[PDB]
């Protein structure tokens, strides 16, 4: 069940994040959208208000790269609603010129948010348990030539997820950690490859990514949401890596 | 071959780095030791001077985390031996309490050093070619419960190496990138898993990894040097993952 549970989704004003938020609110959940984009977040919240209830959503503007901001955002989330049951970490960028910030946002922020969610969720620290869902890509399971740091960040995310799952199992925290790896999703992050200001030296080789995209296909963000509702609804699923593609669909990386 | 080539090996004051430096100097290559430990580097340099020629070693104190020092160390290394031919990125600290520093030292520093090596080594830019070998662990392709962020860093190293190999093949830089994934190697980093000021919250489960170490045995740093020499000697090896264990031995991750 999801009804009555509090969900905290990072970067949920557009793309996959807002699809996750819509799915969670459809199943019934008080949802906190945190995002560093003020206008995008306000527009997303005002759109979600029209079909859902006004009081089941809460927008917070914060940069997940900052640590004090993330801690204070978690403080506001748990203060407003009251608890925390689902934590989805999907705030990624495709900047290769400033790859340091890309690594700080994709990987460091994921681990920091996971630790904060364990702080506010683990039974040892006081809580009932829950789920923490980390969003990686198939780049975390296979190499991508035109974006090395993004591949490294996704690999780090998947490794950290499938190790922290075993850790949390050992610590009796009651928190189950799973990772979601989509293929290509029709979002804005897909048009970033076409620009050199966040691609840099690899802007000359952006055609290979387009060829791969055409060969495989493009996934609707709603379908990705069906993955999130599938891991949450299953209690006996800890550390499993969800893979979403076109031909196969929603399956798992049998390790 | 490395009969007269120049190698920048990282973290060569002690442990695996010292074995790499000894092997390379035995083969005939000038070696630039880099370390953040003044005394540990000075003693290693004195020993290597007493063994090999005085002029084939150059010790430079630098913290690989600091970007300015790292780019101001490559400058002196290339301003001393003239060229750069081998780049061994080997600098890992196990510290889960300050996991931000661990991530910065293990993953960010390796990527920055690889980018500097491509800047100073790519055939199209001003160079001739060479090899960049990033040191990883078997935890780079397996989950480890008692150290999640270390697993994430190693997964990032593996993914970045695998992707950057294809990238460098695509840009015609002539630089070959490979990664090494040893098992348990008898060094001074295994004593850090028995320290609560170094492992933090996972110090109650160090027995689980100690059981694994006793089970798979331990490895001699000379074997990792043999693996490095095997990687460098073969010109048809780009992106191959180097696995060293005690039963199979030196072999490759067949992806
Ligand atoms: N869209 C795709 O085709 C794929 C995306 N993913 C992953 O899904 C995640 C999100 O999906 P996208 O398609 O990229 O959506 P997107 O284009 O909407 O980008 C994610 C959103 O997160 C927010 N965000 C970014 N950096 C942030 C930060 N530092 N602090 C707070 N909020 C921040 C922004 O609102 C941004 O629009 C990313 O981590 C991405 O790597 C996974 C596989 C493929
Ligand atoms: N020893 C083992 O059993 C395993 C080790 N490794 C890898 O080997 C490396 C560790 O070397 P070991 O010989 O095992 O032990 P070690 O800890 O003695 O070697 C690492 C050395 O690197 C240097 N170093 C650390 N941080 C630095 C920094 N920021 N700047 C400059 N120098 C720095 C220090 O001199 C340090 O002693 C790591 O890269 C680790 O991932 C891989 C698999 C298992
Ligand atoms: C059957 N099959 C087999 C292989 C396969 C591989 C991929 C596949 C392969 N490289 C990828 C590299 C990067 C990303 C990614 O995160 N991006 C894109 C760029 C913008 C940022 C967001 C996704 C990828 N996705 C997708 C589908 C299939 C597939 O359906
Ligand atoms: C046949 N076989 C099969 C599996 C296997 C697994 C490992 C194996 C399994 N977890 C590992 C986890 C971490 C590290 C590591 O980097 N540390 C240790 C801690 C201090 C920092 C440095 C190495 C590991 N090494 C080793 C050998 C075999 C092996 O020989």
Author numbering:
A (entry chain B), B (entry chain A): 2 to 256
Q: What text does the study give?
A:
The enzyme 15-prostaglandin dehydrogenase (15-PGDH) is a key negative regulator of tissue stem cell activity in proliferation and in the repair of tissue injury, whose negative regulation of tissue regeneration is conserved across multiple organs. 15-PGDH acts via its NAD+-dependent enzymatic activity of oxidizing and degrading prostaglandin E2 (PGE2), and related eicosanoids, which provide key trophic support for stem cells in multiple tissues. Specifically, 15-PGDH catalyzes the rate-limiting step to initiate PGE2 degradation by oxidizing the 15-hydroxyl moiety of PGE2 to a 15-keto group, thereby inactivating PGE2 from being able to bind to its receptors. 15-PGDH assembled as a homodimer, which is the proposed physiological form of the enzyme.
SW222746, has a similar IC50 as (+)-SW209415, but is based on a quinoxaline scaffold that is chemically distinct from the thienopyridine-based structure of (+)-SW209415. We used cryo-EM to define the molecular interactions of SW222746-bound to 15-PGDH, which were interpreted from the structure determined with an average resolution of 2.9 Å. Strikingly, SW222746 occupies a nearly identical pocket as that of (+)-SW209415, while using different chemical groups to maintain critical interactions with key 15-PGDH residues. Specifically, as was the case with (+)-SW209415, SW222746 is fully encapsulated in the drug binding pocket with the α10-α12 lid of 15-PGDH closed around it. Similar to (+)-SW209415, the closing of the lid again appears to be orchestrated through π-stacking interactions coordinated through F185 and Y217 of 15-PGDH with the quinoxaline and quinoline-2(1H)- moieties, respectively, of SW222746. The amide carbonyl group of SW222746 replaces the (+)-SW209415 sulfoxide and maintains the specific recognition of the catalytic core of the enzyme through, again, a hydrogen bonding network formed with the critical S138 and Y151 residues. The piperidine moiety of SW222746 replaces the butyl chain of (+)-SW209415 to maintain hydrophobic interactions as well. Additionally, the elongated quinoxaline and quinoline-2(1H)-one moiety of SW222746 form interactions with T246 within the β7 strand of 15-PGDH that is not observed for (+)-SW209415 binding to the protein, and interactions with Y217 are stronger for SW222746 than for (+)-SW209415.
